[PDB]
């Protein structure tokens, strides 16, 4: 479908323009071509951000096939640089040693290819104890073992994200059908304790109210420090105008003026905490897949 990709690029360019980002065809088009065979059956969403990432729109294609190595695919098509850094060998170790059943890719309309995601099934989640054995894992995973076990999340890794551009990795917890992160992680006492322990900014009232609604968390780690760099809470909802946040103008426009109607999850909103403050993210769902409802929680 020549004109399926052309139509998709058009959606991408218009959506970027709603959040005041100029899309680069030279970055996007090679990627759409490289993954053309897995786009129709993927879940596609478009994510805007506040803070420094406000200069790009992330395009996410998830729930791609089990047999796909999306990093290998990107490398073969020249979309991401060949590297000797362990970031470039981690995905293969993850897929071999954790029960990974699907994957995903992220690219910026201006930045190009940036991340992969590796998804276990809700029936069999990943473990920090599996991750620490891998030759390419960040030291920070083992360094933070006590944190993961304290909060009861060490055996419920629901996604592994790898950012090739930043050389970081995200570990996600929650979000699967029948799965739960422990309740106390979302209550004010816990939110304060977690951000305190991790040396992150104290939670704003906005974050505290937002956390009440959350059932997914993720931590970002790097290879160059033992410290968790950020801790993010996410909320799924069809009614993002009802979230207890002061929405950025670009976010209001993406909600009201996207060139499509949202599907499935509709929206996934995130508030990231770093050592220096907080920033917000919102993902608007363009293409959903019904078969994913068996694996992922999708009402909000
Ligand atoms: Cl499959």
Author numbering: 3 to 302
Q: Can you quote the paper on this entry?
A:
Structure analysis of this crystal from (EpzPwt) and comparison with the two earlier structures confirmed that lysine methylation had not led to structural changes in the protein. Moreover, the EpzPwt structure showed that, in contrast to EpzPm-SPP and EpzPm-nat, the C-terminal portion of the enzyme was visible in the electron density and found to seal one entrance of the β-barrel. One of these, the C-terminal 310-helix in EpzPwt, seals the reaction chamber of the aromatic binding site of dhPCA. The aromatic binding pocket of dhPCA is located opposite to the diphosphate binding site, within a large cavity inside EpzPwt. Interestingly, we found substantial electron density in the cavity of EpzPwt, in an area near the predicted binding site of dhPCA. The density is indicative of the presence of an ordered compound. Although we were not able to unambiguously identify the nature of this compound, we conclude that it is inserted into the enzyme during protein production, as the shape of the density does not fit with any molecules used in downstream purification and crystallization experiments. In the closed structure of EpzPwt, R267 points towards the active center, whereas in the opened structure of EpzPm-SPP R267 is orientated to the solvent. The aromatic substrate dhPCA was docked in silico into the active site of EpzPwt by the use of Vina. However, as crystals of EpzPwt were not reproducible and other crystal forms could not be obtained, we were unable to prepare a ternary complex.
